[PDB]
Design a protein around this ligand. Structure first.
Ligand SMILES: COc1ccc(Cc2nccc3cc(OC)c(OC)cc23)cc1OC
Ligand SMILES: COc1ccc(Cc2nccc3cc(OC)c(OC)cc23)cc1OC
Lengths: 184, 183
C-alpha cells in the first residue's frame, strides 16, 4: 500500500522535522515519486490533516480498548485515558511526536478537529465540560494542545528515564495538567 | 578569556545535545585542548553545575533589573518575572534551552539549587511559600522544573511564531503554569 507507506514516512519525517518536512523527502522515504504523494493527498495540507486523524485514530484505539469503564467520574476517566496515552506514546514516540508537531501547526481544519473530537465521544464530552473555554476555542486551541502535549511529553520523558518513579511522575503530571487546563 | 569561551561553547553544545554533549567537542569549540577544560572545571558534573549557575545568573540579571519594585503582590510579581523571563529566553534561545537541558538532567546538586535561588531572594521566597511542596522536594524538583520549563518553552514558541498574540500567549501560559505548580 503506497498510501500506508506514505503515512508512515510522513510520521517519521514530521516527528523529526515538523510540518516543514518537504513532500519530496516524504515521497522518497516511502519509495515513490512526489507526484505519487500528491496522487494520494491533493495538497500537503491535506496530508497533514489526514495524517493527524490517522495518528489520533491509532491512539484512540488504545485509549478505548483499554478504557476501564466501570468509571463514571470524569477526572478518574481522564486519569485512565492519560495513563493509556502515556503508554501509547512511549511505545510509539514518533507517532506521538508527529501528533504534537501537527497539533501546534495551525494547519488543522475545522472538519479535522470535529472528526477528532467525535472519534472518542466520552473524551469530547469531558473536554467540552471541563477544559477552560479559551483552550477549546478556534483562536487558542492549538496553544491549549501545545500546553497539554508539553506536559505529556515531559511526563513521558521522566517516566521513561526513571521507571521506578514512573507511576508517580505519571500521576503528578496528570494532576498538574488537570489544574492547568481544566476548571470546575 | 578561555573560561568564558568554555562556558559559551558548553552553552551551545548542551543546548543542542543535552548533557550528553562531549567535553572534547566543547573544548575544541572553545579553542582549547580537552585537558584545559578540566583545568577550569574539575569534572563534567562540575561543568554542568557551574554552567547552570552561570546561565541562571545571566537570566536573573534581567529579571532583577526589570522587576517593578512597587509591586508587592506575590502572584503579580511572578507574572512580571515570567514576562521578563520569556523576553530573555526569546532573546537568548540557546541559553534558555541549555538551562532546560541542565535542569531536567538530575545532575544539579541541592547546593546548586540553593545557590541558584539565593541569587534572586524575592523569587526564592515566593517559590518556597507558594509552590506545591512536592515540586520543591529533592526527589521531584527536577520534574517540577521540567513541567515549568515545558510550559515556558511552549509559551515562547507560540509568541515567537505568532507575535500578534504574544501578550495573550504569555498571560495564558503564566496562568496555566501557576495553576500547575502552586497552591
Ligand atoms: C500522554 O499523551 C496523551 C494522553 C492522552 C491523550 C488523549 C487526549 N487527547 C486530546 C486532548 C486531551 C486533553 C486531556 O485533558 C485536558 C486529556 O486528559 C487525559 C487527554 C486528551 C492524548 C495524548 O497525546 C496525544
Ligand atoms: C520563561 O522562562 C522563565 C521565566 C521565569 C524564570 C524564573 C523562575 N525560575 C525558576 C522557577 C520559577 C518558577 C515560577 O513559578 C512557579 C516562576 O514564575 C514566574 C519563575 C521561575 C525562569 C524561566 O526560564 C528559566
Amino acid at each position: 500500500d503506497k498510501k500506508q507507506a506514505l503515512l508512515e514516512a510522513a510520521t517519521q519525517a514530521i516527528a523529526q522535522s515538523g510540518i516543514a518536512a518537504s513532500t519530496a523527502v516524504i515521497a522518497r522515504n516511502a519509495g515513490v515519486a512526489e507526484g505519487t504523494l500528491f496522487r494520494y493527498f491533493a495538497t500537503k495540507d491535506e496530508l497533514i490533516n489526514t495524517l493527524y486523524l490517522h495518528l489520533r485514530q491509532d491512539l484512540c484505539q488504545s485509549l478505548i480498548m483499554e478504557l476501564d469503564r466501570s468509571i463514571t467520574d470524569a477526572k478518574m476517566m481522564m486519569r485512565f485515558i492519560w495513563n493509556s496515552g502515556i503508554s501509547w506514546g512511549l511505545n510509539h514516540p514518533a507517532r506521538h511526536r508527529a501528533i504534537r508537531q501537527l497539533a501546534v501547526s495551525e494547519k488543522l481544519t475545522k472538519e479535522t478537529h470535529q472528526r477528532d473530537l467525535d472519534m472518542f465521544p466520552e473524551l469530547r464530552d469531558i473536554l467540552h465540560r471541563r477544559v477552560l473555554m479559551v483552550f477549546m476555542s478556534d483562536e487558542y486551541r492549538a496553544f491549549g494542545d501545545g500546553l497539554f502535549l508539553a506536559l505529556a511529553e515531559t511526563t513521558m520523558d521522566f517516566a521513561a528515564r526513571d521507571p521506578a518513579r514512573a507511576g508517580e511522575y505519571i500521576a503528578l503530571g496528570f494532576e498538574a495538567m488537570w489544574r492547568a487546563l481544566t476548571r470546575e
